[PDB]
Design goal:
The structure is a homodimer.
Chain A: E1 4-5, E2 10-12, E3 15-22, E4 27-28, E5 42-50, E6 69-76, E7 83-86, E8 88-92, E9 95-102, E10 109-118, E11 126-128, E12 144-153
Antiparallel strand pairs in A: 1-3, 2-3, 3-5, 5-9, 6-7, 6-10, 8-9, 10-12
Bound molecules: zinc ion (15 copies).
One zinc ion (ZN) is lined by residues 77, 110 of chain A.
Membrane topology (chain B): Lipid-anchor
Protein name (chain B): 34 kDa membrane antigen
GO cellular component, one term (chain B): plasma membrane
């Protein structure tokens, strides 16, 4: 299917992060508080894989990194209003990613788009740390940031 | 070195391997699993998508995250069943579900059963539109991978 870029891919910490958007989708179940397919403007996704620095956490380089907590913030240029969107983990036909249907609440124009990526909760995920079978890396304590300062929402491209 | 619990199983969209080896130290220490010191071994469920997993959007061979995996161990000759909640974690060789385990009934032959629940509807979603979505849906009853004659003969390390 057709995907449109949010901006240039980013490397931040042990993650390679891409941002794409396309038409709103129907999801099962419908996640969190996201707008329906009909009410949304688009679906936005964060593609997140481990880069070379990820190998120290035990991920295979290039593999999807699960259990992250990803939140997008959208802010139209010239506006003080910031939208906070919690992404959910989900599969499309092209595999696991984090994503959301979203509305651009201040309409057409240029937005700053910022993904804040928190590590797997210490309540949810662990690392082997023994010398024999363990890893020498550790999760990051403050969320990593991938952002694009000049994303143009010029309306549906579909 | 890793030791097999038994032959790998394919069940539904999942290829499931079970292995065990020496107890490990985990950060943070999961649930109420025994420490490296208290434990007999570490058991892991290695779970990747098989060909049928493509219908759910997975690439074949991909780790399948957000599952809930619980093991049941019953020594031959006993009516007692020990339940072990596995946790998701990384080792040097990647993401898996695992736990440190102490075999309450000790040395002997065990039935070992992994019950694998799909991601909570709370936790995970599928695109289901024709354009970008998948045709499969998650399973409702937990998938089972079971080995009837696992021989626990003590540390092999
Ligand atoms: Zn890329
Ligand atoms: Zn990459
Ligand atoms: Zn990269
Ligand atoms: Zn359902
Ligand atoms: Zn991907
Ligand atoms: Zn501007
Ligand atoms: Zn995609
Ligand atoms: Zn999506
Ligand atoms: Zn196999
Ligand atoms: Zn297989
Ligand atoms: Zn920590
Ligand atoms: Zn693996
Ligand atoms: Zn494997
Ligand atoms: Zn392993
Ligand atoms: Zn493990």
């Amino acid at each position: 299917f057709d995907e449109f870029p949010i901006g240039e891919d980013r490397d931040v910490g042990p993650l390679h992060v891409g941002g794409v958007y396309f038409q709103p989708v129907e999801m099962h179940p419908a996640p969190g508080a996201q707008p329906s397919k009909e009410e949304a403007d688009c679906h936005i996704e964060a593609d997140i894989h481990a880069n070379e620095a990820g190998k120290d956490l035990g991920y295979g380089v290039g593999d999807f990194v699960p259990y992250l907590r990803v939140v997008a913030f959208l802010q139209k240029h010239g506006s003080e209003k910031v939208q906070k969107v919690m992404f959910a983990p989900m599969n499309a036909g092209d595999g696991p990613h984090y994503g959301a249907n979203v509305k651009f609440e201040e309409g057409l124009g240029t937005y700053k788009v910022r993904f804040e990526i928190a590590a797997p909760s210490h309540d949810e995920y662990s690392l082997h740390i023994d010398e024999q079978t363990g890893v020498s890396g550790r999760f990051w304590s403050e969320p990593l940031v991938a952002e694009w300062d000049d994303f143009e929402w010029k309306g549906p491209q579909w």
